[PDB]
Structures are given as structure tokens and as C-alpha cells.
Ligand SMILES: [Fe+3]
Ligand SMILES: [Fe+3]
Ligand SMILES: [O-]
Ligand SMILES: [O-]
Ligand SMILES: [Zn+2]
């Protein structure tokens with residue numbers, strides 16, 4: 162009946178229209194070391210974040226899952242400020258990034274000590290049931306991530322710890338797949354360790370344009386997310402045109418109750434400001450929190466997708482997921 | 485004539501007896517993500533650090549270089565507190581750890597943007613000549629590090645940025661070599677890019693037990709450090725007995741003016757507390773800041789090493805290095 166948001170427990174029935182995957186803040190591991198030229202401008206960042214939140218509210222969004230990994234600048238206290246200000250529900254995560262772009266040296270060390278998996282489990286349990294540092298904010302989801310073409314042994318420690326923690330807490334698991342790979346593998350591995358498919362979201366599934374890969378992942382009974390609308394050119398990404406074509410094939414096949422949509426936006430980048438070169442920038446020009454509503458949804462409607470299906474995805478699915 | 489310490493500029497002539505490589509705080513990249521169970525206990529940590537500082541002072545140490553990488557928990561403000569308390573000079577660094585155990589994803593990303601080398605350079609220049617964040621503390625050395633058997637392209641950006649910055653500032657460069665490899669390569673690569681051998685310390689040279697490897701590194705005119713006394717079995721390290729044998733061979737060959745000594749201790753570990761499993765842990769039992777003075781130095785003296793040579797290493801070499 163309840164889910165933990167950054168402002169405390171909230172009835173699942175009150176979540177309403179939800180974006181399953183967006184980042185208010187995000188930094189690549191190592192951004193901390195660039196503190197002198199890349200310092201965190203709090204007031205400006207909160208402005209940007211609050212504005213992003215208001216744009217979502219304007220399209221009827223009431224809830225956001227922000228699955229920023231512990232090692233990528235996750236900041237629950239900041240999230241709580243964004244939420245207090247806007248009345249938005251924000252659910253945060255506990256978890257580490259994938260080994261390739263995460264910060265593995267620390268838990269790799271604890272693996273040599275032979276305590277890693279249990280320490281990770283302990284960390285999950287603590288942040289889900291007690292609180293994150295001294296914020297007294299609890300995570301509402303566990304965040305897992307795998308590398309391209311592989312779930313590494315480092316990554317598997319997290320997967321195994323997450324299944325254990327989900328068995329103990331009933332927590333929702335949300336994943337990152339890298340460049341359209343390992344969806345089926347992720348679902349299978351989690352299920353083999355007793356994870357509950359109705360509590361799992363395989364993320365970045367839109368990274369793969371082959372509907373059979375999707376059906377293979379969907380066969381496990383898990384949710385899948387097309388959560389990178391707007392992202393074009395970078396991190397191996399397909400086009401929105403392909404995202405839509407794939408999504409339409411699935412919806413037409415009756416998979417609406419297993420699909421959620423989002424953009425994976427990064428509203429404030431941690432570390433030093435940067436600008437993409439307009440080979441990529443203009444390809445990435447619709448990567449913002451309104452893109453789904455302004456561009457994608459109308460396109461789906463013009464292809465015969467009905468309001469009931471849209472509602473299933475944005476409202477009914479998150480409610481079922483968290484309950 | 486001056487060098488930047490955490491308490492401001494200091495006459496090089498006043499540095500006195502110096503440990504070239506010790507860490508008051510250190511954490512493996514990713515420690516930040518374990519904040520809930522691994523929170524930073526400031527008061528206790530400052531105690532431990534101040535004590536470590538006093539033990540060094542008691543053995544006549546006046547200056548310590550703490551070359552903790554930016555991405556491994558470097559905390560200049562904390563260092564400044566340790567120094568204010570004890571009167572010890574502490575010189576800190578600017579630099580990132582090696583790829584394999586650092587946090588590469590951030591500057592790897594800026595490489596794709598094609599600005600990495602210049603941003604790193606910009607960071608060096610800023611921390612050496614302006615200050616680190618808002619602490620107003622400037623780094624006195626640039627820290628570089630390479631992987632086992634290789635200096636990676638990621639690492640080479642830092643090496644190239646450091647040569648540039650040293651040409652502009654005359655800053656001292658101090659390196660990490662991984663498991664006794666790349667000493668000669670590091671010196672060659674830095675020299676090829678116009679770095680000054682008399683301002684370079686190739687570190688962890690004690691990781692290799694073959695004197696010809698050492699002579700090859702020493703031929704570039706650089707300093708080397710045997711800076712891991714007390715560390716045994718772990719990270720591929722040899723024994724102190726081997727460290728001593730190798731060091732004796734070099735001193736007997738007249739290399740005293742190019743060698744410095746330290747322990748590479750980690751006085752406070754960042755992230756969650758741990759204990760090394762008991763067979764490794766006893767191997768590592770003398771890994772503490774008094775080991776050199778209580779155990780190693782008397783052994784060198786019993787092998788005929790004179791006071792003048794010891795003084796050359798602990799006092800004369802640091803003076804020449806920083807001037
Ligand atoms: Fe994401
Ligand atoms: Fe070190
Ligand atoms: O992501
Ligand atoms: O080190
Ligand atoms: Zn992701």
C-alpha cells in the first residue's frame with residue numbers, strides 16, 4: 162500500500178501519472194575529483210531541477226523515479242528539496258552503476274576481503290529500511306546495471322544482493338541495460354535467484370530495435386522500459402523513429418501492461434559544464450522532459466494508440482509495479 | 485625558494501626531514517556510494533591523523549608529502565587541520581589515480597568531447613597556482629599514476645597534462661607505479677614531453693626487486709622512491725627483506741642523491757571499516773609510520789649505511805627536489 166519517497170511513505174494509489182526514469186542530478190564517477198573547476202552550484206541547480214519538475218507537472222506528471230546510482234552523485238536531500246517545492250513525489254534508488262562507467266574499485270576491494278556481496282546486501286537493506294546517511298530518506302527502488310554484452314562478476318554481486326534484498330523487502334528493482342544487450346539475461350539471472358518478475362523493470366530496452374529480443378525479455382513476466390526517448394547518436398542509441406516502430410509493434414501485440422516510458426534525462430550534470438558538438442547536440446536536441454508529451458505521444462495517437470493504453474502505461478503500470 | 489603546503493608557502497630550506505609519500509586519508513573510488521554504512525567520522529579521523537603526525541614528529545619528521553589523488557578522497561581542508569595542530573608541513577597533490585583503480589568515467593567522457601587533456605591541464609594549473617575548491621590551499625605536487633605493465637591512453641592524458649603544467653609552473657611530479665612496472669617508461673614519456681627529471685619522483689620503485697630495472701629508471705636522472713616499507717604480500721608487493729637488499733645494492737653503487745624512502749601508509753581509510761583476513765594482516769603488521777625508523781633504518785645502519793647517507797635521503801633530496 163505504501164512506497165518510500167524522498168518525503169516519506171506515500172500510498173501507491175496516490176502516485177498517479179509517473180515517469181519511471183529521470184535524473185535531476187547525474188555525474189560520471191570521477192566528477193568529484195574535478196571539484197575546483199566543476200563545483201556544485203546548489204541554488205542554480207535547484208532552480209533547474211524545480212523547473213524540470215514544473216514542466217513535468219504541467220503534463221500531468223505527479224511522480225518521478227530518479228534511479229541515480231550511489232556512485233553517480235545521488236543526493237536524496239537535494240531531491241527532497243525539489244519535491245518539497247513542487248509537490249511532486251520523487252522515489253530514489255540504492256545501487257551502483259555498471260562496471261564500465263561506474264566506480265568499481267571500492268567493492269572490488271571488498272570482494273578480495275570476501276565480504277562484498279554481504280556488504281552490498283547490507284547497504285541495500287539499510288537504505289531501503291533505515292535511511293540514506295543522515296537524511297532519514299529511504300530508497301524506494303534498487304538500481305542495478307550491466308555492461309555491454311555481459312553481466313560481469315562485479316555486476317553479479319549486486320544482482321545477487323538485490324534479489325536477496327527484494328525477497329526480504331519486496332523492493333522494486335530497476336535496471337540499466339547497456340547498448341541494447343542483456344535484457345533476457347538480466348531477467349533470467351534475477352529470477353534464478355528468486356527475484357519477483359512483477360517487481361522488476363528492465364530498463365533501456367528501447368536500445369534494441371529487434372522485437373524478438375523484447376518478447377524474449379517480456380516472456381519472463383517482467384516490466385520493460387522505453388526510457389530513453391530523445392537520446393540520439395550517443396551511447397549507441399537508436400532513433401526515436403525506431404523506438405516508436407518497436408514500441409508500436411509491442412503495443413499492437415498486447416504488451417501494454419508490461420511497458421513504461423521515460424526519457425532518462427539528466428537535468429543537472431555534476432562536475433564541469435560541457436557542450437556537445439552539434440553533430441550530436443542537434444541529434445540530442447529533443448532530449449528533455451517534455452519530449453514524450455509534445456512529440457512522442459501525439460505520434461502514437463496518430464498511429465491508433467488509444468488513451469486507455471497510454472493511461473495503462475503511465476498510471477496503471479507504476480501502480481501495479483509498486484504494489 | 486618556496487613550496488606550497490596546506491598552510492601556505494614555505495621556504496624549501498625549512499622542510500627538513502621529510503616522508504615523501506604517506507596518506508592521512510585514503511578511499512578507493514566508490515567509497516562515496518557506501519556513505520550510509522561508511523560515513524566519515526571527522527573527529528575520530530582527525531585524532532588518528534594527528535596521532536600519526538605526532539609519531540612522525542617524534543622521529544624528527546618535519547614535512548610529509550600526502551599524494552592522495554583527487555578521486556581517492558583527497559581533503560586539503562582536513563590536511564590543513566592536521567598541520568595547524570601539529571606544526572607539521574603537509575604538501576598535497578593534484579592528480580587522478582590510475583585507470584584500473586581510479587574513477588576514469590568522468591574524464592573518459594571529456595575525452596569523447598575532445599577536451600580532456602586540456603581540462604586536466606586546466607585543473608592542474610588551477611590547483612597549483614590558484615587553489616583547490618574554496619580552501620585557498622594550493623597543491624605542491626602533481627600526482628600521476630600508471631597501470632600494471634602499461635601506461636594507458638587515459639593515463640597518458642594526465643602524463644601529458646602534467647608535463648605541460650610542470651613546464652609552466654616548475655611543479656614537482658610524483659608517480660605511482662603499479663606492481664613494479666613502467667618506471668623507465670614513465671620517466672621516458674615525461675622526458676619526451678619536456679618534463680624536468682630533477683623534478684620527478686618515480687614511486688613504488690621498491691615494487692621491483694631487480695636492480696637493473698632501477699638503474700634503467702635512475703639513468704633518466706629522476707628520483708626514485710622506496711615508499712612502501714611495511715607493505716607485504718598485498719598488491720603484488722615484495723618483502724621488506726627484499727626492499728632492503730635492493731636498496732643496499734643501489735646505495736652501495738652511489739645512488740643516494742636519487743633515492744627517497746616512505747611507507748605509503750593509509751592512516752584513516754574512507755568508506756566502511758574493515759580487517760584484512762588474518763594471514764595477510766600479519767604480513768602487513770609493520771605497515772605504520774614508525775616502521776622505517778624503528779626497524780628499517782637500524783638494519784641499514786647495521787649494514788654499514790652511514791648517517792650522512794640517511795640524511796641525504798631524508799633531508800638533502802627533498803630540499804633539492806623542491807628547489
Ligand atoms: Fe538513468
Ligand atoms: Fe600512495
Ligand atoms: O542512465
Ligand atoms: O598508493
Ligand atoms: Zn541507465
Ligand SMILES: [Zn+2]
Nearest residue numbers: 659660661688
Ligand atoms: Zn601509489
